[PDB]
Design a protein around this ligand. Structure first.
Ligand SMILES: NC(=O)c1ccc[n+]([C@@H]2O[C@H](COP(=O)([O-])OP(=O)(O)OC[C@H]3O[C@@H](n4cnc5c(N)ncnc54)[C@H](OP(=O)(O)O)[C@@H]3O)[C@@H](O)[C@H]2O)c1
Ligand SMILES: NC(=O)c1ccc[n+]([C@@H]2O[C@H](COP(=O)([O-])OP(=O)(O)OC[C@H]3O[C@@H](n4cnc5c(N)ncnc54)[C@H](OP(=O)(O)O)[C@@H]3O)[C@@H](O)[C@H]2O)c1
Ligand SMILES: [Mg+2]
Ligand SMILES: [Mg+2]
Ligand SMILES: [Mg+2]
Lengths: 338, 340
């Protein structure tokens, strides 16, 4: 149980999804001594500013959540994904070493694993084939971050642990059209399809912030939403897994308190996959959302699988608490209040 | 491309490749060079590197600076990845920010899978795990290559990675236990010869030592004696070598002739690094006999009973460069300088 009530804990990237979940869960657990810096206060690409922060604040524990994330919308930023993430990683990990940080947790992505690797993905599949093209430079940076943690642990006897996940979600999602991730996008589609099937024209106009029902029906049809059906743009066979941000926070804190480099060690692949151990076809996710929202209509289909093997984290005494059905239900309850 | 009055930065100019580039550029009239020692410019320090690029505005960059991975320093596993990532990231990003026209970076064969087929094609990147000792160094070299290519794709830069296995050259680093295989082999046979000719004085001056009993036990433990040079292994281990004049030639040829657009012409926009080399490897027996004959050592070669590595240089040949220095000729050039 390494971290104590008054241990100084730095959560890097604290305004992000994982960072917000860590701050909330640490405060609930009674951790009273968090240090938090916005991007405007501390640019983690700038070595001079990061070295100064560590020398002047001397945090004891570090959760490194800050990232330039690689997504469909920003995939053109191929150089930024490698440069900015290597700089964040290098500046935080090295200055943590220089200032005698006790322990650090870093987060990897399943983009670090080969595109053609077998599911479920084992930690030892690192370097067993080429990465997916769009996320190639991002995944290469995450590999370097994992190797940076292990290499410091070996040379300098640091305690820097890498946890690797595929897809993070939480209750308070972004539900904006063409800007929303898979679960929130499906939730909103099914909610609006339900409102259409119930003739709640008034609630449709409120939801879309529109003033003309003919215009609203056109807009909904363009997004495959109708009284009788929701269109899934795909075959429905793409598989997806999910981890709730409260489960990410739980396993990150569990790792900080219990899982040391000692416990993991020609030693290599000392990163640890995290997840729920189960995935879902987009068809299965859609039917689950449909059922939770209570839409009486049909799916219609219109046309890289990633599942972590969680054997290692299970063996080290953590498992997830939040099943996807309960996460989607919490997300929908939140949706209705906003 | 580069003009003789173009401002050219050679990073790491005191190293083997950097010294060869400085000399070969001067010999061709490229005299507008900017050169910084480690004391003048610590390339790990982002602030200092950003200031250098903003002050000096080099037009062309040869990035040769490295923390090298060898048998002796293999414990420095964190340093290999941190220091080299910082050098790479600081020079490549600040080159982009300051409108450098073209950059050449050097990779290592340690960026290829340990068990990849010889000869190694560029496309064997990420086709299996790296050799354990050089794992973190090879990962840093991969990130260097991907950093160049990713800048070329996103920003339209012209940053080219050339990858080699073993460098030697006229003005080489002859320090013992640096895993500088060919320079050290040349030195091992030279000292064996000095012992054979009974030249205590030159042994002590070469080793910069004082006591001959201690010079001897130093030498005997590197397998150096008056009667023999003893090498650990079977004699069958194969290695490829490139002379630093050939490295300088292909680096300058790349600047003058090879642009990113040439590397994605009827090729995928991936694995755009280029292997360089002579395309030929040798057993340690064959190299040791070459060295023995050039040094004129009259004693024995003895083998006392690591994986073969050879580049496929088809792509650089297709782009219009091939090596000029055959190994025997290059070792002769290196020995002549060594004796000077
Ligand atoms: N979300 C996922 O599905 C997913 C999947 C796999 C892996 N992961 C990994 O999990 C970790 C957490 O991801 P996340 O989704 O929580 O990230 P996120 O929501 O995108 O948050 C990233 C945070 O980092 C901050 N940041 C980025 N660059 C910075 C810089 N130069 N200086 C200071 N702060 C900077 C951002 O600040 P601003 O708010 O000011 O921009 C933001 O608050 C990352 O390592 C990520 O790669 C996430
Ligand atoms: N040599 C080989 O067999 C071989 C094989 C494959 C690849 N390569 C690659 O080819 C390139 C050239 O290698 P090389 O053997 O010529 O190199 P080298 O002889 O080892 O020289 C490296 C130079 O970089 C300088 N340097 C290192 N860190 C620095 C820092 N923080 N700030 C400023 N200068 C710094 C060193 O300065 P100091 O002298 O002050 O320490 C040194 O002069 C490298 O990219 C290398 O990895 C070489
Ligand atoms: Mg314990
Ligand atoms: Mg000026
Ligand atoms: Mg041309």
């Amino acid at each position: 149980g390494h971290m104590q009530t008054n241990s100084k804990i730095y959560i890097a990237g604290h305004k992000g999804t994982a960072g917000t979940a860590l701050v909330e869960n640490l405060q609930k657990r009674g951790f009273n001594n968090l240090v938090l810096k916005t991007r405007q206060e501390l640019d983690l690409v700038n070595q001079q500013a990061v070295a100064k922060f560590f020398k002047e604040e001397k945090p004891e524990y570090v959760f490194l959540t800050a990232v330039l994330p690689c997504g469909a919308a920003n995939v053109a930023q191929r150089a930024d994904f490698i440069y900015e993430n290597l700089m964040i990683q290098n500046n935080v990990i090295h200055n943590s070493f220089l200032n005698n940080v006790k322990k650090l947790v870093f987060f990897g992505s399943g983009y670090m694993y080969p595109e053609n690797a077998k599911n479920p993905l084992k930690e030892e599949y690192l370097f067993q084939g080429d990465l997916e093209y769009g996320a190639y430079s991002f995944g290469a940076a995450k590999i370097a971050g994992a190797i940076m943690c292990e290499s410091y642990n070996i040379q300098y006897g640091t305690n820097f642990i890498t946890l690797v996940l595929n897809n993070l979600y939480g209750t308070k999602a972004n539900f904006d059209f063409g800007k929303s991730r898979v679960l929130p996008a499906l939730l909103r589609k099914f909610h609006l399809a339900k409102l259409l099937s119930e003739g709640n024209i008034t609630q449709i106009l409120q939801d879309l912030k529109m003033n003309n029902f003919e215009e609203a029906k056109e807009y909904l049809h363009n997004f495959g939403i109708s009284k009788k059906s929701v269109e899934i743009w795909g075959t429905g066979k793409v598989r997806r897994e999910f981890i709730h941000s409260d489960d990410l926070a739980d396993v990150a804190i569990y790792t900080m308190q219990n899982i040391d480099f000692k416990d993991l060690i020609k030693s290599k692949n000392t990163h640890i996959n995290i997840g729920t151990g189960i995935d879902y076809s987009i068809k299965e996710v859609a039917l689950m959302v449909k059922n939770i929202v209570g839409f009486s209509g049909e799916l219609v289909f219109n046309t890289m699988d990633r599942l972590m093997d969680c054997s290692k984290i299970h063996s080290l005494g953590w498992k997830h608490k939040i099943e996807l059905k309960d996460g989607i239900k919490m997300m929908y309850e939140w949706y209705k209040t906003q």
